């Protein structure tokens, strides 16, 4: 009717406004997309030129005011670190893994509150799937001696460790100092739980079923303590007394980490004593004992490293 | 030395500049991040108010110049589509699936050349993994009658269909009109290839091994024709004569799509005749015949839908 168009025009009176407002935004979006690329080639050509200055300096300090020359070291150690806080608000480019899974989308959070809010969502993610991986691995272990439910647990374990590699790769390019092992221990665990699906139900599977299930039920319990430490370390780093918490959550975490690292060792030697048995006929016995042997030496000799660097600091 | 610092200062004569330049960028980045949210709440409150105008009109046209009332339709048919080209340069928010896998990162490409360059990379991705899924499924089918290599093919098939759901979900929020089935046919195929790993090597597996392997070797060959059509429809839509190609690549695609849809039907009825056999003892016989029965009715009655809408246009 008449008024039916009267309200139709009182709403398009400002549709000229957003149409006007959306012009001055795609213009801002396009001039901002060039300020990023401008600011990216200019701090990357200086940095590659900066290290060139260091090598020209590195060769002389052995041959040589002993520190008058290394007074230039702390001059380019913070500056190269100044470039790192610069490059933290510039869009990076995906690595070989994210370009595979996601393509060439941009995954860098261009804020300091957005890297936080994403690393908080990441710790909550590992906690919510820890409440599922400890409820599904408890029925599997105690309530149901089945194989369709045990294969549904390894399909969650595979999907949960594949989602970690993706989320730990979005953290790694948005400014996270995740040591190389922790991102590899997820590929090793996806593999170890992948060869766990191909394992035919038989006599060796029922002899390692209780060990694997009650370990990945413990490995979820220790991820409840990792959460409360990890999320307490990122909610306190945002805002001396922080090393009194860090050296308290760690003291109450290491015994539960080393009881887990020596359960992976025990889980490996088992699959090596299940192989020497004639009733064994499956390669999956040996090809699980090696991941449990990698995950031991990798996790153990890295958690010791993390404490060897925190002891000095 | 002396000149060793002379070049140290000639390189930081502009480090005051980028430090200056990087201030005026994070300021632009922060005022742009507010222009997006400003422009997002203003075209979403008008749109939800726009449909309100339509319902206030929709009730009167049956009860009632009746076309002077319905000329309001095409007045807000493209207007609501005008909002769709607006919202195409604003960052969306991830759906329930991307928020699971990726978190709350932003995955929308804010350009028209960036949505193209990402949908081109997506078609090339499906082509490169089609050359792997046709080389690994040919050895499996003809060269190697093994089980560790057949389980390595289903682990690629699972990973390939899980990477499609992620990449088809980044397309869907960056402006792609992918029909609901095509994104579901990937969850059905991941499941069907997931219950293909749990299938214990036995007597029923060796009776369906040749069918499944030679189908997923055909299904890769038809993805060579899908690529050259999909990428030909993507490089021509960028730049009458386009319906002469579209109705030619389609004419040479439908016979290869319906020979594939009636192979999924044949693959389903087989797993229903492998169940009625006493020598069958595995639920995986039935739980594959249903996905092959979904993938038939879903793919077939959707490819017919796609041709039923292109016939009218
Ligand atoms: C000591 C420990 C508990 C955490 O200490 P930490 O202070 O967080 O480690 P770092 O000082 O090296 O910091 C590395 C960065 O990556 C994170 N990080 C540390 N361990 C990580 C891990 N396993 N996975 C992902 N991120 C990790 C840290 O939060 C930090 O992030 P940020 O600097 O961007 O904020 C670590 O050894 C750990 O997490 N071990 C788990 C291994 C395990 O599960 N063993 C049992 C198997 S049954
Ligand atoms: C007809 C067909 C070949 C493609 O026609 P089409 O014109 O591309 O489809 P539409 O017109 O509906 O367009 C839908 C959108 O999603 C894309 N699309 C179409 N089919 C798609 C599919 N299976 N997967 C992903 N995207 C698809 C289109 O490229 C288009 O993208 P865009 O508009 O953002 O540029 C389609 O039926 C198809 O791809 N079928 C494949 C199913 C199959 O593999 N069967 C054999 C199984 S053995």
Author numbering:
A (entry chain B), B (entry chain A): 9 to 72, 76 to 250, 262 to 335
Question: Which text from the study accompanies this structure?
Answer:
TACAN, originally identified in a proteomics screen and called TMEM120A, was categorized as a nuclear envelope protein (NET29) that participates in lipid metabolism. TACAN is an α-helical TM protein that forms a symmetric dimer. Each protomer consists of six TM helices (S1–S6), which form a barrel surrounding a tunnel open to the cytoplasm. The TACAN protomer is related in three-dimensional structure to a fatty acid elongase, ELOVL7.
To determine the identity of the small molecule implied by the broken density in the tunnel of TACAN, we determined the structure of TACAN with His196 and His197 mutated to alanine at 2.8 Å resolution. Our rationale was that if the His residues are catalytically important – by analogy to ELOVL7 – then their mutation might influence the occupancy of a potential cofactor. The map showed clearer density consistent with a coenzyme A molecule (CoASH). Native mass spectrometry (nMS) was used to confirm the identity as CoASH. After incubation with CoASH, some fraction of the apo form shifts to one and two CoASH bound forms. Additionally, the +767 Da and +1535 Da species are replaced by +795 Da and +1591 Da or +811 Da and +1622 Da species after incubation with the two CoASH analogues S-ethyl-CoA or Acetyl-CoA, corresponding to the CoASH analogue bound forms.
